[PDB]
Amino acid sequence: VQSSVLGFPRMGVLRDLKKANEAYWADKISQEALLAEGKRLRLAHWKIQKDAGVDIIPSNDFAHYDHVLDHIQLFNAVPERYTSQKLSPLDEYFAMGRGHQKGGVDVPALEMVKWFDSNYHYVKPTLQDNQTFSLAKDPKPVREFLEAKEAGFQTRPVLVGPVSFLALGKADRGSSVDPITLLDKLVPVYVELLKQLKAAGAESVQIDEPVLVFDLRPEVKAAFKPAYEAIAAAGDAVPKVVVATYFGDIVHNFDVLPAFSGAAGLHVDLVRNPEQLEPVLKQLGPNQILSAGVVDGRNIWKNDFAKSLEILQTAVKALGSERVIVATSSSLIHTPHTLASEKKLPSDVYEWFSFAVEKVKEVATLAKAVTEPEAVKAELEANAAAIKARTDSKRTNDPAVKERQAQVTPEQHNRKAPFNTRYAEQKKHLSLPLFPTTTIGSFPQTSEIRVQRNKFTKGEISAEEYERFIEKEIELAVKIQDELDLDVYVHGEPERNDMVQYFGERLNGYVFTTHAWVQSYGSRCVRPPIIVGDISRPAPMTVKESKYAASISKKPMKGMLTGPVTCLRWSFPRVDVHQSVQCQQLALALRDEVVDLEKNGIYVIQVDEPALREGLPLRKGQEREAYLKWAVDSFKLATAGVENSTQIHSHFCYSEFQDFFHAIAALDADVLSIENSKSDAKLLKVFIDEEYPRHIGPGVYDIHSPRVPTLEEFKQRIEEMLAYLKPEQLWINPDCGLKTRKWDEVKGALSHMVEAAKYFREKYANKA
């Protein structure tokens, strides 16, 4: 039985790729130097995988920025605004990913969006009506396959397949083409590329068609047959093809699978959906190979070898060992490089973890164990003991948390009274005028704010000295808000650097790494907290600063929290219990924090869930409905403990809620803010159609621009919003937090903002 890795993280043991990319962008190293570092990393990572005993090692998984972006360049699908600058291929590549400035011109990046339900972002293929495709000179997959081959590594090239490539694409500005209709123009280029890989020596290729986990539009569904017929028709002139799927099951698309009858194999994610194994077995062709994705590509836990081998033996029993491959469930770009870089973790949790270097060893150990378990009996035993240690740990058996969860009731999820009743108490308490003004949360992060925070966390300044600095920062924020005449204040969060790490550090059940970085957005990486045990709140988390802020505030002061769904999803979650269990534990901890804020003079509490939509199961059905139920319930459980006169706010970082508005409405939030200023106001139609009864602040100010909008621009935006929303429900606020702006920009814009609000207060004043 062979082992397989679908992809390896690109950044390097010390984020070498980030350092080199950025040094190149800053003119500190040459193109040759940067490309040499890329080469050094590919070689090092191929070696890791070969040394671990992996049989099927991926190539073309490496990328300097994004692999979908690599495919855009590979098929010459680059828009004119990039090709006319006559840049080197590398600079052109980077131009599409992050932007460029040649000859005076200022070329923006292509749109980047999230890769399925992961925290990784890809660049969307952006296509013209008259789009055609051709293979780039020196095509990357061929180049890199030959590179590996020359260094002694036989590898399996990874391509994003033609259907997914178009399905994940969009029409460019000025065009209206539905990308999938370009299929016939694209497929011949894949066929040519595949012939070139075969000629270079590639015996097989992994072709990712991840959109198979979606509910497919009939046009996209219809595309697989001609695409994969063309590939099969090429016969021995192209490599054997393993079609790969991950992050969801594909059992709803068994009518699409006949398109792959001429393909050599199918990969499915048996970590996310182990139950799809046997139904999928029934759908395999007589000689097709099952690539069984049983080592988690999305989390950091040591594999349960015994559980994985039961899955594998089921497959081997049905197919024979020669038709089974042990594989990672997905690419490992979603995992950190290596556990070995971590030197400060609690000694008991090491034996529960596996990062990417450890996982590629796991698929090899499993593959050997399938047919020769005696050869690795010591490793199998050690693995079983580690899993048992995790099961029996104090961390995962907190009796108090268990008892608290057991006693949660449905009624505890609901506010004391509906909004019709509540809002009466709130308008008095808060003394809000028509068109109340507020901001979303963070205030400018200045050099001094970062420096001081760094000194404290590194222990250079005392707690007392830092606390006094934070007080003065809050006093400044309040003074400035006084001068602006805002109606609801924020403290500006000078003490916070990250909206999940800040809370993870103040909760039981979390551990933090120093080096476990994961690529997120180009060369921007994240270092997620890890949930290792039952979660509870040992002490007040945000009360100290909010309490101080309210003590000097002449206006209502916003409390500021991250919701339980986001604390969960932007961490590495546990895999030993269901995520709904973890989320409820977070919701109870946050319920206490909310009630604590209310007890300390805070009666406007903003609870933000930027990960709510991200976690949606990728296809409709009982699973998606299950998620929405506990995700919504968790938010409600966290926020329902307040008095009627207390307002619950929530900020949403997107302007559209397709197939999602019902969940938003179910939150029962008193006030919603949404990112909207750059969107057509007509998108506010959803509030009319859904007859949304509570209050709404669509952003009026694009905070991602340093430009100060004029008073007239603010008034015009407000007028446009009032075409869709009732006056009494409209809040006036920016699109987003103000951390990335500078105070002169902020004072100017917020001044115009408040003046515009005051104008409409006059305009909507009662007549004589």
Side-chain angles (χ1 to χ4, degrees):
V1 178
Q2 287 189 309
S3 59
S4 155
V5 171
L6 270 61
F8 195 85
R10 313 160 177 153
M11 307 314 294
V13 62
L14 290 173
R15 290 180 292 164
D16 316 38
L17 180 57
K18 172 185 182 60
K19 172 185 185 177
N21 275 349
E22 288 174 3
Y24 175 73
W25 297 333
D27 294 325
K28 305 199 306 187
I29 63 168
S30 69
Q31 170 158 131
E32 320 82 76
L34 173 60
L35 292 175
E37 190 76 331
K39 173 173 181 179
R40 179 188 67 81
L41 287 168
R42 290 189 298 275
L43 294 176
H45 299 165
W46 286 324
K47 188 184 195 309
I48 290 182
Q49 295 174 88
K50 189 172 191 180
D51 291 345
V54 179
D55 300 304
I56 305 173
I57 305 186
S59 58
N60 202 46
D61 52 314
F62 180 87
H64 268 275
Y65 199 84
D66 171 53
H67 63 297
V68 181
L69 181 61
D70 291 319
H71 283 75
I72 290 163
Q73 189 167 48
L74 172 60
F75 301 136
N76 284 322
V78 189
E80 180 242 281
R81 64 182 167 282
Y82 304 96
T83 55
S84 53
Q85 314 301 323
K86 299 301 299 176
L87 305 166
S88 65
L90 182 61
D91 293 327
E92 178 181 289
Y93 174 80
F94 282 135
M96 286 184 289
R98 13 141 45 210
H100 192 88
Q101 305 84 33
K102 186 237 105 148
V105 325
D106 190 36
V107 186
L110 294 176
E111 185 183 359
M112 293 181 48
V113 300
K114 266 138 189 88
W115 178 253
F116 297 88
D117 68 332
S118 77
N119 232 332
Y120 178 77
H121 303 70
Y122 74 99
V123 177
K124 300 187 69 76
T126 298
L127 307 176
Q128 326 298 314
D129 292 333
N130 67 344
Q131 189 74 52
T132 64
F133 305 96
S134 59
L135 203 56
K137 288 183 178 180
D138 189 36
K140 174 181 186 297
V142 175
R143 200 201 306 146
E144 295 193 350
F145 173 85
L146 285 170
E147 190 183 272
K149 188 178 184 180
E150 269 159 33
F153 309 104
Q154 179 73 17
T155 67
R156 186 175 78 181
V158 179
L159 304 181
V160 176
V163 178
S164 287
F165 176 86
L166 292 171
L168 296 175
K170 55 184 264 201
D172 204 356
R173 81 280 178 91
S175 298
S176 60
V177 61
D178 181 18
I180 198 60
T181 62
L182 299 172
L183 180 75
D184 288 349
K185 283 161 188 169
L186 179 62
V187 160
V189 182
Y190 274 83
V191 169
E192 177 58 28
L193 169 62
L194 287 171
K195 286 177 178 168
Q196 290 186 23
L197 284 166
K198 177 65 172 182
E203 300 301 326
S204 72
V205 167
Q206 168 189 325
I207 298 188
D208 291 7
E209 288 287 6
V211 301
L212 284 166
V213 304
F214 284 158
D215 300 298
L216 293 171
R217 320 161 37 203
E219 299 106 340
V220 170
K221 184 175 294 189
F224 288 99
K225 180 178 184 297
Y228 285 81
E229 271 174 358
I231 294 179
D236 293 327
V238 294
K240 289 180 291 181
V241 174
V242 174
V243 182
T245 65
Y246 34 75
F247 305 157
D249 54 339
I250 63 165
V251 304
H252 64 303
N253 275 331
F254 281 168
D255 54 323
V256 187
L257 293 192
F260 308 130
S261 60
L266 179 68
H267 174 93
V268 290
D269 184 338
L270 298 172
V271 168
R272 182 69 170 81
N273 292 89
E275 79 289 340
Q276 78 174 320
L277 169 64
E278 296 190 80
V280 167
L281 291 178
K282 298 284 99 198
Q283 301 296 326
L284 291 172
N287 302 130
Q288 288 189 318
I289 296 162
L290 179 77
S291 168
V294 297
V295 170
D296 199 340
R298 292 276 301 271
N299 208 335
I300 44 68
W301 297 92
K302 176 171 295 177
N303 189 261
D304 185 330
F305 285 170
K307 187 174 301 183
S308 296
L309 288 161
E310 287 187 19
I311 291 176
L312 296 168
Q313 294 296 353
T314 297
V316 171
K317 198 176 199 305
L319 309 184
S321 59
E322 298 315 291
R323 284 171 66 211
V324 178
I325 291 171
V326 182
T328 63
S329 66
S330 68
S331 169
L332 301 179
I333 63 174
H334 309 291
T335 70
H337 188 90
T338 185
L339 176 62
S341 293
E342 298 304 319
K343 301 188 197 187
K344 303 177 65 65
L345 289 173
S347 47
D348 63 325
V349 310
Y350 282 94
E351 66 179 6
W352 308 339
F353 294 165
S354 291
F355 298 175
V357 165
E358 297 74 41
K359 292 169 185 289
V360 301
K361 178 64 167 178
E362 286 178 341
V363 292
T365 304
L366 287 173
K368 178 60 62 176
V370 167
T371 64
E372 307 174 43
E374 277 289 322
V376 290
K377 58 180 179 174
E379 290 172 70
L380 299 181
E381 196 282 337
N383 183 271
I387 297 299
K388 186 175 165 49
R390 193 186 70 189
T391 307
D392 296 344
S393 176
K394 209 169 162 180
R395 302 181 176 278
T396 56
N397 289 278
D398 183 320
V401 174
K402 181 180 185 171
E403 180 60 20
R404 186 175 185 188
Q405 300 192 253
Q407 301 299 335
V408 173
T409 70
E411 290 69 24
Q412 281 157 356
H413 295 77
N414 296 317
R415 295 286 296 269
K416 296 184 191 313
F419 183 78
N420 295 322
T421 305
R422 305 205 294 264
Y423 181 67
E425 306 210 47
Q426 299 171 357
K427 58 167 183 50
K428 325 178 310 182
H429 189 20
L430 273 40
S431 79
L432 301 184
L434 202 55
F435 312 118
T437 59
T438 195
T439 66
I440 299 315
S442 59
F443 273 153
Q445 192 172 250
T446 65
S447 174
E448 181 67 3
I449 285 175
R450 292 186 300 264
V451 158
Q452 291 298 293
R453 185 188 295 121
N454 284 338
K455 291 186 176 179
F456 170 70
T457 63
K458 256 158 53 177
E460 299 188 35
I461 59 184
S462 64
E464 201 275 345
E465 172 178 351
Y466 184 53
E467 280 172 352
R468 176 58 54 75
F469 170 79
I470 292 301
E471 275 174 13
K472 279 175 305 177
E473 285 303 323
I474 291 167
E475 295 163 23
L476 179 62
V478 174
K479 178 200 95 180
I480 292 170
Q481 289 169 110
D482 287 339
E483 303 179 339
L484 287 170
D485 215 22
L486 285 157
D487 299 292
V488 176
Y489 290 0
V490 298
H491 72 283
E493 307 170 46
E495 80 284 2
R496 313 186 189 186
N497 197 17
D498 180 275
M499 62 186 292
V500 171
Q501 170 189 290
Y502 187 81
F503 290 93
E505 288 173 349
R506 294 163 174 77
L507 291 168
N508 295 321
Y510 283 79
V511 306
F512 283 77
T513 72
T514 59
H515 285 79
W517 293 95
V518 182
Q519 182 184 3
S520 178
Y521 194 104
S523 282
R524 180 197 313 148
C525 305
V526 293
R527 190 174 53 190
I530 301 169
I531 299 165
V532 294
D534 296 325
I535 295 168
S536 59
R537 185 195 68 135
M541 304 184 285
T542 70
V543 169
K544 179 178 183 62
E545 293 76 15
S546 284
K547 181 188 202 297
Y548 181 76
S551 79
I552 58 170
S553 183
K554 73 184 191 175
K555 297 294 187 181
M557 176 68 56
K558 278 195 187 175
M560 204 81 23
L561 306 174
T562 300
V565 175
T566 299
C567 288
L568 171 65
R569 276 206 64 88
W570 283 3
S571 305
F572 284 112
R574 292 163 67 185
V575 296
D576 65 329
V577 301
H578 198 278
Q579 290 186 8
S580 68
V581 175
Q582 303 173 58
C583 203
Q584 188 182 63
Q585 295 174 356
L586 279 156
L588 294 166
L590 286 167
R591 189 188 177 91
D592 292 351
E593 179 79 13
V594 167
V595 166
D596 274 5
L597 288 163
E598 189 181 52
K599 273 182 194 168
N600 283 270
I602 298 284
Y603 37 80
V604 181
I605 306 178
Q606 184 173 297
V607 182
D608 291 337
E609 289 279 37
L612 179 64
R613 188 170 198 175
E614 298 183 9
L616 196 72
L618 292 170
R619 73 179 176 98
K620 68 190 167 58
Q622 306 178 28
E623 191 176 347
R624 175 177 285 170
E625 291 176 19
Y627 165 77
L628 282 179
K629 175 163 175 50
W630 62 256
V632 166
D633 283 350
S634 297
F635 177 95
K636 293 181 73 183
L637 184 60
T639 51
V642 291
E643 305 298 329
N644 285 343
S645 53
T646 291
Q647 286 195 335
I648 296 302
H649 291 212
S650 195
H651 175 63
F652 289 77
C653 273
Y654 32 93
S655 48
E656 274 167 90
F657 317 96
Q658 273 256 347
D659 322 318
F660 202 71
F661 192 91
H662 293 177
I664 313 307
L667 304 178
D668 196 15
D670 301 296
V671 179
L672 298 182
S673 58
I674 65 174
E675 295 195 348
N676 208 262
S677 72
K678 297 147 59 190
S679 293
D680 198 311
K682 72 176 174 68
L683 274 49
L684 296 179
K685 180 166 171 288
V686 60
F687 291 103
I688 303 175
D689 288 338
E690 295 286 338
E691 305 183 7
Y692 191 75
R694 299 186 300 277
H695 289 6
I696 311 152
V700 290
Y701 159 36
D702 174 22
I703 63 91
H704 294 287
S705 171
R707 192 188 70 94
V708 177
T710 69
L711 173 64
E712 291 310 299
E713 286 168 331
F714 277 103
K715 293 160 77 168
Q716 178 55 32
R717 187 58 181 171
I718 292 174
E719 200 77 76
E720 293 170 337
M721 288 190 314
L722 284 168
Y724 296 86
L725 304 178
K726 299 179 178 177
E728 63 262 32
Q729 74 192 157
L730 187 61
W731 281 62
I732 305 300
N733 46 252
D735 266 355
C736 198
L738 292 162
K739 186 208 309 184
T740 66
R741 294 271 60 87
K742 303 206 306 163
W743 268 118
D744 62 312
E745 300 153 1
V746 170
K747 292 194 184 194
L750 294 187
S751 175
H752 293 165
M753 192 187 76
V754 169
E755 285 303 311
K758 286 176 175 179
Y759 174 86
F760 277 86
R761 281 177 207 161
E762 282 278 2
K763 182 175 191 171
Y764 277 80
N766 296 325
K767 299 303 170 54

